[PDB]
A paper describes a structure:
Potyviral CP plays a role in virtually every step of the viral infection cycle, from transmission of the virion by aphids, virus assembly and disassembly, regulation of genome amplification, protein translation, to cell-to-cell and long-distance movement. CP consists of a highly conserved globular core flanked by two large extended regions with a high frequency of structural disorder. The C-terminal high intrinsic disorder region (C-IDR) is partially conserved and packaged in the lumen of the virion, supported by the helical ssRNA scaffold. Here, we show that we can control the shape, size, RNA encapsidation ability, symmetry, stability and surface functionalization of nanoparticles through structure-based design of CP from potato virus Y (PVY).
Numbering used by the authors:
A (entry chain Ag), B (entry chain Ai), C (entry chain Ae), D (entry chain Ah), E (entry chain Af): 54 to 222
Amino acid sequence: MRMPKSKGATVLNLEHLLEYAPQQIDISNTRATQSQFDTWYEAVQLAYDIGETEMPTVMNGLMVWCIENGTSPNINGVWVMMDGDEQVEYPLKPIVENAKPTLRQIMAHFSDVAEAYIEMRNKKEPYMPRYGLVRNLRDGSLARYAFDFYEVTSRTPVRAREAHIQMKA
Amino acid sequence: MRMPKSKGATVLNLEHLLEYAPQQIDISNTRATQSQFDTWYEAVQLAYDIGETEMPTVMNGLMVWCIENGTSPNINGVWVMMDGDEQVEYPLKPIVENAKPTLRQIMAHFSDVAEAYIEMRNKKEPYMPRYGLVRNLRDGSLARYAFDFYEVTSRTPVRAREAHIQMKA
Amino acid sequence: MRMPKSKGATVLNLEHLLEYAPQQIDISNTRATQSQFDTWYEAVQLAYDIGETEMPTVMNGLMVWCIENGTSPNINGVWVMMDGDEQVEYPLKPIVENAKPTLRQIMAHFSDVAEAYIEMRNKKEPYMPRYGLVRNLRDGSLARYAFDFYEVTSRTPVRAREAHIQMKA
Amino acid sequence: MRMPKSKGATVLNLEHLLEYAPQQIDISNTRATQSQFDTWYEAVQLAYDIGETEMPTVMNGLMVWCIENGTSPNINGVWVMMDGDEQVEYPLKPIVENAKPTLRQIMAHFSDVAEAYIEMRNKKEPYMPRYGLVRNLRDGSLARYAFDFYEVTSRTPVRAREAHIQMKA
Amino acid sequence: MRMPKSKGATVLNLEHLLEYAPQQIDISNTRATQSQFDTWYEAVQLAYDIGETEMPTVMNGLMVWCIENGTSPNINGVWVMMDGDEQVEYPLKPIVENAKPTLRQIMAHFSDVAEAYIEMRNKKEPYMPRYGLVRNLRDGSLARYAFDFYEVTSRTPVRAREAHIQMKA
């Protein structure tokens, strides 16, 4: 093999070269960077006039809303939260404006947790996310992966990779 | 797994995260929100000069009309109600103007009840909604699902999902 | 045979003609020339204000970043390095501007080493570069070749040649 | 690179230039200078016979008026303030006079605050400034940029830059 | 080939022509000559009553002003310097006078240094000169070329050549 050279010197080290072991999600372009996610968090927090005691509760339903309604909604719209049987409405402009590059990449930070919620739902009655009810997904084991902000990593079953290709087609 | 992080703190809670259990129809974009449905109700009520004693009766036939004539009609038109053998006419502009985002989403609040009416009809003589007589649906058990404002949830038989895909194609 | 002639004289020699034995990568247009790589190295070094003691470490992650995120990114963007659990951000404009003719050819100097890193990763948990998770590559032995700046030489297995044709299609 | 030279000596420090980091709005010709704004403030104060206890209230209504009626009005005209349900009438020549170079540049000092007021109005009922209701702007998210005295800096989203080009055309 | 001839004798050495290798900027008409620049320097120095200890600081702000406000301003105007938070006001006729042929050609001597300042600003927050924010330049990499007194030589990337043609159109 040949290691990169510049003016007769190696430019890629020898020890740390075979020691750097990052995580796939961290250095991937499918999700927004940590700085971008932080900016989106406070911008949404400042727009809704919510403190640090109710904001975690509010963001629980936004992830659930994006499971069943996607991550590319109309800006001039609203997304719903339910406190009991009442539909509590929130403006959707702050969610999208302050999300860079796209809301899907920002929502991709919720990929791991969103499967836990769907698996919970798939313990009482069959629950299939709408994103999979419009692309004709019949499997009941792939319901945990039927949201548009899912991150495909090197831990995803092969059937799921084919399903997302079929879904997005 | 990794839960969303912002400035070294979890932003998705731990207990209410695995307790929020909404209903699919409530947080879905296939139907208008409760506020939107309320606005459409009074706007139509105020346009027809009807009180709270005949309006429930009038809206019974509007749902039946939309079963057999769809939810995307010409605004400058009329929809018919039958009191005995006489065709009582109502303007159709108030139904569509005041419906946001679309009349189909507003009519989607009648998805559950519209199946009860069709099943009633399918107890004396075979009744197939027109929306299914123009897309060549031959099954007699799918007649209860042959209206354009049907809501596909995680309780719909798999054959029905294929039928609507075939119908809308 | 006929050897090139000009004014009644051979113009291709006889001894050194059958002695010149270059290497395929050196005289190939799939990678930038040594002068071009040197210019890109110092230009990136001068833009980041880094000496000759940390620059080899920084370029380790840029190669890893290009494995999972390609070699044609948006100039007005950033690429991430991880020191522990923190995302250290670098501007991406110096990487692309000063790379001639393209960053893929400049990154092609890292083709040999990038396989060593992937093979390392493929010793603890299955690691498939993202560039192969979006083109539906299922083989686990071709993971070492699933980056866009791979150089196809006369040492590459035949299956790999077909895979890259299928991947790039 | 080459420095500017005069009689064999450098004419630029290039050490304080590294220090020199002015703000874009301060050294821009899109807004009047601080001295010009001070002249306009006192002259308007002297024309309306108002002290330093009601003038801050007075200029609150002037900024809102320029949002909905532009910054190029007739000199022989009036601008309206509302105290309750009554229209308080103010002469408009004191505004369009003593405002150099133009009233738009003087009004550009209110660009930041004018967006806070618009974002306030877009929390109860949809509010689009009349400047955007005559140029066919159908995106309510861009309502915060629909005043002619908006200042385009290097913090404006790319959407707003295209919208203003479309509006001013 | 044919040499220029006069009375049966060559009029060109063609041995010193091989020696003659001038710089493109030096013998270009896009910038004022050295004598013209020296005249503009002393005349501006004599007009502002400033010595040789503060003038290098003074011209630092003038170059930045021309980046964001162009090199064709009104003679009966002022250009702003910032010492801290205060706007220092300077007359602008001493600048647009004693600057022949044009101020742009005089300002062209700062083309190399003006890019260093812009590249400095594009290290903390995105900074695009106002010259490019009014001509719809959406590429932040080309921010280093977004001043009207830029000199196009045979070292400018092909991107910048097309951008300036698009901008000046």
